[PDB]
């Protein structure tokens, strides 16, 4: 209400969060940040600044936008 994390509203702030991002994740910080997701600093776990939705266990083939949309259909950012 309205945005869950206003400090992660900036795409640059989401990108900056992806320090120590694991090589095993197979999704880039730039793809994740463009879909409104920032790094929590744990495993491959990311969160949306807008809806507060959290996503983990990324697999090769996943698209950041599609996964965000599908699991968080009320999110205004990927609507």
């Amino acid at each position: 209400g309205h945005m869950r994390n206003p400090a992660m509203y900036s795409e640059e702030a989401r990108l900056k969060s992806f320090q120590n991002w694991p090589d095993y994740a197979h999704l880039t910080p730039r793809e994740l940040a463009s879909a409104g997701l920032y790094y929590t600093g744990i495993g491959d776990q990311v969160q949306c600044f807008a809806c507060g939705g959290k996503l983990k266990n990324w697999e090769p083939g996943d698209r950041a936008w599609s996964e965000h949309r599908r699991h968080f259909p009320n999110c205004f950012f990927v609507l």
Binding site: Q45, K54, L55, K56, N57, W58, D62, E67, H71
Partner: peptide
């Protein structure tokens, strides 16, 4: 990806 809270 898996959603969680």
């Amino acid at each position: 990806a898996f959603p969680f809270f």
